[model samples]
Each structure stands twice: as structure tokens, then as C-alpha cells.
Target: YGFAVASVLPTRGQVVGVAHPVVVTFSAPITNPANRHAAERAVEVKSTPAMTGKFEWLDNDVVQWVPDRFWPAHSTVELSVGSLSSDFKTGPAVVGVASISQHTFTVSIDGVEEGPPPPLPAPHHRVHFGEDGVMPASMGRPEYPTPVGSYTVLSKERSVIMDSSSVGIPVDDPDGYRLSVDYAVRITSRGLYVHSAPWALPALGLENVSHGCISLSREDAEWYYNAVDIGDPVIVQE
Candidate 1:
């Protein structure tokens, strides 16, 4: 069997920053989800972003780990693997060491400095539901629906009521943009988030439902929101 390198999951150096759980997804899918044997080998990480870190295998072929402290602001990261390699079930040939690809992300830690959240673009169209749902058209803005963009996240609060039906999940400094539209897109807090609806089904494509925040399909939002650090860019465009 010819040896080759599988594709890296993070593609972009497994970017991890402030308040983020260190994650390093392997290049190939693990043959055995239960046994993470190859993950034990040896993996090294060095960074200009400046942060202490380590690797923890979530499974044989896939792993995600991070340093005890937050990764530095505005830095580049590099990941390397020893001679060890992972074997997939079928298709793509087995590859040895996957070449290290350097991915750099600007890590800003403030809302104002990062600039406004993705503008409420020209199209605020809502194609799906209208009955009693998560984000009413008022806060939801169906067509525009808060374009997937980046905001510095000025501030954060436990909770703040915006109106009789909705409330603002205040960020640090929300000067421009919809001052009254509560952007409830949080992952840490169970109640303070703008994820997919717990009640919706088909649950894919444009059929998603949420209060007034950007709601991605379950699988989509899970990986997406996790990538979002406080000051990190949060883009959500079509």
C-alpha cells in the first residue's frame, strides 16, 4: 500500500485563542472511534501567538487539545507530527507525516477594536416559519437575519431584557448597529445563546429557527460557535 498524508481537519492550524478550549483535529478520520491508539504517538506545537499547550486524543485518528492558558493575540501557529501516521478505512491511500500547513488568524480581544458585527446587509429575508418560534421577525430580521460577520463584542452581561418578548445579551460597546436588537449568540451559557431551535425539525438549510440571534443548523452551529472566541471574527454570510 502506498503511503500518503490525509487532509488536516482544522486546515488552519487549529486556531485557539482567549477563552477557547484548545482543539487540534487530526488530518484523517479515525478508523476506530473508540480506540485512539495513534493519537498517543508524539505531537508538537510551537506558536508566535504565545500560549502553553498540549495534545489530548479524543479518538484514534481525531484529537483536539489546547494549552492551560489563552493563546496570544494576533499570532501565527504551527503544528507538526513525527513519523507516525493514521490509516483510514478506505479510499485515499495511507499517508505518512502530513506536511505542516501554517494558518494565521488575527486575534483581537475587544469589540470596538474589532469593529461592528456583520452589517444587517441589504437582504433581511426570512423564508420559513412565522408562528410561535424562537426569533420573531422584529428581532430575527428574516431576510437580513444579522449577516454572518465579525464584531469586537464590546461587552457581555448575564442578561438584559430588550422588550416584552425579547432581551439584549449586552456586549461591551454596542454604539452603532441595532442598539436595541439583542444579539443573543452565546455558547458558554445555556440560556444566553442564539443557536438552533430545540423544537424545529428537518432542522437543516433555511428551515432553522431561533429567538433573535443567528441560528445555524445543529451540526453547523456546534462546530462554528466553538470556533468563536470572545474577540474573534464572527462572520455569518450566505
Candidate 2:
């Protein structure tokens, strides 16, 4: 089967609203997940004011280019299939450009002072964690402390292997253990994660006894996992 540009949204030489996304679909599905990145890179977009944007895969055959912010009113945009020929490995390649004109748009603001303006509501999801020692005071032992600061969700997974040794705890140590976990959301580049921990159920809410990572129930973790996306805020406060 040959690869071809199935469709490009906004059609050629069409006027569209600012919120309309630049969508593209392929005639054939991308069988290799690894090649999806290259396919995204192959789709090129150029706009006036030199706006910034990122390509996100909607599925095996569909990808979209979304701008970081709303498109400026009266700006022009052009889309083209470029460099995709090398990645397709097919007999013949098909491609074309989809030119678009952004129509004027407006936002409604209610009851605000003339000078400056109040800050906008937080536009991202946030996760919070509290601090309390896992052990009772009688034990007089230091408990694991979850860091108190702001972080962003770096990545997400339905399941993952959490090894204590990977976090500096020796395998033979009494406090060290490793196991498979589900509904994991990575919050830090330094290996910190917020994930389901049925094994540490007793310590949750009652105490702060995690190895610097937030732990939640499976149901809660899954709910949180589904609710959050990359770049969402996660606040852990003690």
C-alpha cells in the first residue's frame, strides 16, 4: 500500500476561526509507533508573527498542530507535507499544502477595573501531598518526607516497575522493596513519581512515609491519572 495525504482541515484557501486546529490525516495507518515522531516532524506549518506550536498525534493516521496560544486575529497560516516521503518507504508519495486565513475573534471580559486586571484562573490540573510521619512518636524514628514544592507532570503510564534500589535504597535494607505499580504519573525528572501503592495503604493520609514519592489508592490514582496531562501542575506541600 502507498502513503498519501488523506485530508487537511480548513481546506485550501479557506477562512477559519482562531480556535480551529490544523489537522491532517493519512491515507494509510502508521504501523510502527516509533515512526510516529518522524511522521509528525514531516508535517510542516508556517504562520505569520512566527507563532510557536507543537505536533500531537491524534492516532495512528491523524496528527494535529496546535499553537501554544490562540492564533492572532487576521494572521495567515500555511501547511504542507514535507520530509514525509523518506519515512513512508512506499512506491509513490502524495502531498499538498492547506492555506488558511484566521478570521477576527474576541474574548468577553466581565466586571474588571480599567487599570491592569486580576489574574486568570489556574488553567492546569494540580496534585497536592501532605506531611506526617508514618511511625508513631513513641518510635522516635525519622520518617520519609515528601518534598514541599511545585512540580509538573512530566509523563504518565498505566503501569511501571518501581525498584527501591533505583532510589538509593539497598535491596537488603529493611525499608527497601520493589514491585510493579499502576497509574503512575511522573512529577520530576529526578525519579519522583505519584503512583498507586496498595502496599503502603496504611501510611497514606495518616503519615508521610513514602520514599519521597506520593502514593495514592488505585482508584484515586487512576482517576488522577486520567484527569491529568503532561505540563499539568503538581503541588506537594508539608
lDDT of each: 0.33, 0.51
How many clashes (backbone atoms < 3 Å, residues ≥3 apart in a chain or on different chains) does model 2 have? 1
Q: What C-alpha RMSD separates each model from the true structure? A: 17.4, 16.0
Lowest summed lDDT across 10 adjacent residues in model 1 is found at 94-103
The C-alpha TM-scores of every prediction are 0.31, 0.42
Task: Report the lDDT tens digits of candidate 2 across residue range 2-113.
Answer: 3356877656655443434566788888878888777766667555445577787777888877656544433455444553211111111111000111100011112111
Q: Please give the lDDT score at residue 33 for candidate 2.
A: 81
Q: Which candidate is the best by TM-score?
A: 2
> Could you give me the TM-score of model 1 versus the true structure?
0.31
Write one digit per residue (lDDT tens) for candidate 1, span 1-238.
1112344423444433333433345566556634344443434444444456556565554454444553344444443434422211111110111001110011122321221123233134322322111111111335323333322222233233333222343344352222232233453222324343323323223332333354433332333333344433232333
